[PDB]
Amino acid sequence: AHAAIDTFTKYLDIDEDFATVLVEEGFSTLEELAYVPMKELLEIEGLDEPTVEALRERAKNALATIAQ
Ligand SMILES: [Au+]
């Protein structure tokens, strides 16, 4: 458990356990969480649309913040 998990945990403001699930599901960057079609994110266990939209918003805000 390294870089990718730490990024999701810190910038998406979620628990490490779920950040770990994201990596196991094949995700590794904020760009993916923010821009990949929702239908895809909705395929991972534990996620429903409202939460996916919240995570996408956080991913977008994180990218803007990091760019600074
Ligand atoms: Au669910």
Side-chain angles (χ1 to χ4, degrees):
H2 206 63
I5 296 183
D6 299 320
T7 293
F8 290 152
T9 300
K10 266 293 183 182
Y11 288 93
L12 298 183
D13 262 310
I14 59 174
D15 55 306
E16 192 171 306
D17 285 313
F18 189 76
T20 298
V21 173
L22 283 178
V23 174
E24 286 177 350
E25 294 288 4
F27 293 79
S28 66
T29 65
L30 293 167
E31 282 79 354
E32 293 169 334
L33 271 288
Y35 309 126
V36 163
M38 286 197 64
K39 7 292 171 183
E40 196 174 312
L41 312 184
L42 283 171
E43 297 186 11
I44 70 171
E45 308 181 303
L47 286 195
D48 66 3
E49 181 176 54
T51 291
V52 167
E53 289 178 342
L55 301 183
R56 291 169 76 66
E57 180 69 7
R58 294 179 171 194
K60 296 176 185 178
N61 294 315
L63 288 169
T65 297
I66 291 170
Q68 304 311 292

